Every structure is written in C-alpha cells, then in structure tokens.
Design an enzyme around this catalytic site. Sequence first.
Site, mmCIF file in Angstrom:
data_model
loop_
_atom_site.group_PDB
_atom_site.id
_atom_site.type_symbol
_atom_site.label_atom_id
_atom_site.label_comp_id
_atom_site.label_asym_id
_atom_site.label_seq_id
_atom_site.Cartn_x
_atom_site.Cartn_y
_atom_site.Cartn_z
ATOM 1 N N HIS A 82 -45.339 18.035 -24.469
ATOM 2 C CA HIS A 82 -46.202 17.580 -25.583
ATOM 3 C C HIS A 82 -47.498 16.984 -25.058
ATOM 4 O O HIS A 82 -48.508 17.100 -25.690
ATOM 5 C CB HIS A 82 -45.453 16.559 -26.484
ATOM 6 C CG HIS A 82 -44.085 16.992 -26.881
ATOM 7 N ND1 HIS A 82 -43.859 18.028 -27.769
ATOM 8 C CD2 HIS A 82 -42.885 16.508 -26.546
ATOM 9 C CE1 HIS A 82 -42.554 18.183 -27.947
ATOM 10 N NE2 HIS A 82 -41.933 17.282 -27.198
ATOM 11 N N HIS B 104 -50.619 8.034 -21.888
ATOM 12 C CA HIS B 104 -50.777 9.468 -22.096
ATOM 13 C C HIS B 104 -52.027 9.683 -22.908
ATOM 14 O O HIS B 104 -52.639 8.730 -23.399
ATOM 15 C CB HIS B 104 -49.565 10.098 -22.776
ATOM 16 C CG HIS B 104 -49.344 9.503 -24.123
ATOM 17 N ND1 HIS B 104 -48.599 8.375 -24.353
ATOM 18 C CD2 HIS B 104 -49.882 9.836 -25.307
ATOM 19 C CE1 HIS B 104 -48.682 8.055 -25.648
ATOM 20 N NE2 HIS B 104 -49.450 8.952 -26.272
ATOM 21 N N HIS C 105 -54.092 12.476 -25.934
ATOM 22 C CA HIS C 105 -54.126 13.571 -26.872
ATOM 23 C C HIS C 105 -55.506 14.166 -26.764
ATOM 24 O O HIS C 105 -56.484 13.453 -26.613
ATOM 25 C CB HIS C 105 -53.872 13.109 -28.307
ATOM 26 C CG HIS C 105 -52.603 12.311 -28.464
ATOM 27 N ND1 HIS C 105 -51.426 12.871 -28.875
ATOM 28 C CD2 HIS C 105 -52.310 11.009 -28.141
ATOM 29 C CE1 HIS C 105 -50.484 11.936 -28.865
ATOM 30 N NE2 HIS C 105 -50.974 10.803 -28.423
ATOM 31 N N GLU D 186 -56.712 11.236 -32.247
ATOM 32 C CA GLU D 186 -55.763 11.016 -33.374
ATOM 33 C C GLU D 186 -56.419 10.106 -34.400
ATOM 34 O O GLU D 186 -56.591 10.494 -35.543
ATOM 35 C CB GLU D 186 -54.444 10.471 -32.828
ATOM 36 C CG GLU D 186 -53.772 11.470 -31.873
ATOM 37 C CD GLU D 186 -52.297 11.363 -31.852
ATOM 38 O OE1 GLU D 186 -51.808 10.254 -31.534
ATOM 39 O OE2 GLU D 186 -51.617 12.373 -32.143
ATOM 40 N N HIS E 37 -53.700 6.581 -24.937
ATOM 41 C CA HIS E 37 -52.756 5.616 -25.473
ATOM 42 C C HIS E 37 -52.006 4.930 -24.350
ATOM 43 O O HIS E 37 -51.251 5.581 -23.609
ATOM 44 C CB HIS E 37 -51.720 6.339 -26.345
ATOM 45 C CG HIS E 37 -52.305 6.834 -27.631
ATOM 46 N ND1 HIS E 37 -51.713 7.800 -28.459
ATOM 47 C CD2 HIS E 37 -53.477 6.462 -28.247
ATOM 48 C CE1 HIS E 37 -52.475 7.983 -29.511
ATOM 49 N NE2 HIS E 37 -53.545 7.168 -29.430
ATOM 50 N N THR F 265 -47.138 8.295 -33.199
ATOM 51 C CA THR F 265 -47.812 9.480 -33.757
ATOM 52 C C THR F 265 -47.110 10.776 -33.463
ATOM 53 O O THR F 265 -47.608 11.831 -33.830
ATOM 54 C CB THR F 265 -49.266 9.563 -33.295
ATOM 55 O OG1 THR F 265 -49.267 9.885 -31.890
ATOM 56 C CG2 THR F 265 -50.046 8.291 -33.594
HETATM 57 N N1 LIG Z 1 -48.590 8.684 -29.441
HETATM 58 S S1 LIG Z 1 -47.933 7.228 -29.439
HETATM 59 O O1 LIG Z 1 -47.778 6.768 -30.779
HETATM 60 O O2 LIG Z 1 -48.605 6.342 -28.504
HETATM 61 C C1 LIG Z 1 -46.278 7.409 -28.837
HETATM 62 C C2 LIG Z 1 -45.787 6.508 -27.872
HETATM 63 C C3 LIG Z 1 -44.492 6.628 -27.400
HETATM 64 C C4 LIG Z 1 -43.691 7.636 -27.901
HETATM 65 N N2 LIG Z 1 -42.363 7.838 -27.529
HETATM 66 C C5 LIG Z 1 -41.849 7.517 -26.330
HETATM 67 S S2 LIG Z 1 -42.668 6.915 -24.828
HETATM 68 N N3 LIG Z 1 -40.471 7.682 -26.297
HETATM 69 C C6 LIG Z 1 -39.539 7.457 -27.339
HETATM 70 C C7 LIG Z 1 -38.261 7.917 -27.140
HETATM 71 C C8 LIG Z 1 -37.290 7.743 -28.075
HETATM 72 C C9 LIG Z 1 -37.547 7.086 -29.264
HETATM 73 F F1 LIG Z 1 -36.545 6.919 -30.201
HETATM 74 C C10 LIG Z 1 -38.814 6.611 -29.475
HETATM 75 C C11 LIG Z 1 -39.807 6.801 -28.530
HETATM 76 C C12 LIG Z 1 -44.160 8.518 -28.858
HETATM 77 C C13 LIG Z 1 -45.457 8.401 -29.314
HETATM 78 ZN ZN LIG Z 2 -50.082 8.976 -28.192
#
Ligand SMILES: NS(=O)(=O)c1ccc(NC(=S)Nc2ccc(F)cc2)cc1
Ligand SMILES: [Zn+2]
Length: 258
Positions: free
Chosen positions: A62, A92, A94, A104, A117, A196
């Site tokens: 992703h 990370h 986007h 985003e 992020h 997100t």
């Molecule tokens: N784009 S963001 O909003 O910054 C964003 C930041 C972190 C994550 N998820 C991560 S690191 N793992 C995770 C694994 C299991 C879960 F149940 C929940 C999260 C997704 C988006």
């Molecule tokens: Zn993110």
Amino acid sequence: HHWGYGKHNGPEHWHKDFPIAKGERQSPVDIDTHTAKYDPSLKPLSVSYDQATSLRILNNGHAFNVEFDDSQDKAVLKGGPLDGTYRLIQFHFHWGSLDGQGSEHTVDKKKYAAELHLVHWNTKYGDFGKAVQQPDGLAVLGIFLKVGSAKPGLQKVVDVLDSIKTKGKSADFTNFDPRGLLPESLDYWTYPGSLTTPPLLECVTWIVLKEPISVSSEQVLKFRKLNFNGEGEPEELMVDNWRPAQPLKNRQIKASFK
Ligand SMILES: NS(=O)(=O)c1ccc(NC(=S)Nc2ccc(F)cc2)cc1
Ligand SMILES: [Zn+2]
C-alpha cells in the site's frame, strides 16, 4: 481483506468490509483555512526526535513504512492538542501519479504532490494495538510535499527504494534521522479523525503542518517506481495511494497560529 486503491477495490468500496468508512470522524478532510479558528488554548508542540532509532523499511503493498524502535521513549511527540506522551512507531507517505495530486488532506481544496505521515501512539495504552482501540490513541503528524528543490534529508529513503520494489520486501534502515523531513515552522491545524486506510479506526488526533516541505521531481519519480504487486506478478505501479477528503460532519479544525 483485498482492499487497495484501484477501481475495483479502492476507497469507494472500503465501506463494505469496514462500515466505519461512513462514520462521524473519518480522515482525511479538506482544511478550509478561512473557517479554521486560532485556538489560544493549544500548548506549544514538542517534537523530540534526537534519540530516534530507525530499524527497517518495508513495502507493505500500500505504501512503504520506515519503522522505529518504540520499546522505550526515544522519539516522542507531546504538547499542542495532546495530553501525555506519544511514541513514534513509523512513518510513510501517500503520493500521486502526477504532481497535481497525492496528498490526503487538502488545503482550500488544493492537493499537494504527496503527504508524509509520522505515526505515534499514546504511551498510556502500553502498545500500539491497544492504542488504536481508543479515541485518543494515536497522533499523526502530517506534512505536505510540493515539488521544487530536493529535500536532502529524504535522499537516504529514495536511494533504498530500489531494494524494496515489491510487496513484502524489506531492507535494514538504521540510523535514519526523521528531523531531516520537517519544515522550519511547526504551525499546524488539528482535528479529531481516523486512520486513512482500513481498518479506518477513529483513534487519531491529526496534527497537519501548514508549511510544506519541498522535494525534487526526481525524488518523487522514484516513489512512483515502487510496485503494489509482489515479486513475479504483473507490474502495478504504486501511485495514487491516497484516500480523498471525507465529510467534516460535526468537527472543527483548530489552528495553532493567527
Ligand atoms: N495513513 S494513516 O492514517 O497515518 C495510518 C497509520 C497507521 C495505519 N495502520 C498501521 S501502522 N497498522 C494497523 C494495524 C492494525 C490495526 F488494527 C490498525 C492499524 C494505517 C493508516
Ligand atoms: Zn498515512
């Protein structure tokens, strides 16, 4: 879960597996700079990354994540809208297929080329997995990227991307200093939101910096050479891995600055 960013599995489909996608505090959002209000109650923001310990970089299909040792308080975010201490776990990005899209969050409907992020979890909940189940569990520091001059502190990230081209590849990534990714000013907007990406959990205090960082066209072009697919599968370039702006509903965005 086979979610992604395509026509058939992208953001318009996520609600079927993750009904919170249509919830009351989803992210990202458009930041209307005229309606965001200066909040004098916000305490100063403290980004303390001097002891940050990076470990690894991973293509998760992703995006790519730069992961940190979060077994102690080494790199933390405090202050601003936050109560207590939030530990850095990963960062990370986007980004888009072209320089006119990729972020985003948007600012008065403006899309930036990309968005960084930096993800932190509230230490009062002990581990990341417990934190994501709480409304104040995470703090994400969001930083816009525009295309212009190169960002020197980004280049070490750019140069390792060739080694993690496909989903599931990782590489050792020690001694990387996230301080080199910040803009000069820490002026910000803040609001309560969500992850997100699936599972879209409503656990995030968003802190979005007003000042973008500049990166070069060459730097972002290297992001766009990554692949969503695994090794030996048909190539699908990792581009346009952003969720569009979601309804603000009953939220107000606060500004740290006049
Ligand atoms: N784009 S963001 O909003 O910054 C964003 C930041 C972190 C994550 N998820 C991560 S690191 N793992 C995770 C694994 C299991 C879960 F149940 C929940 C999260 C997704 C988006
Ligand atoms: Zn993110």
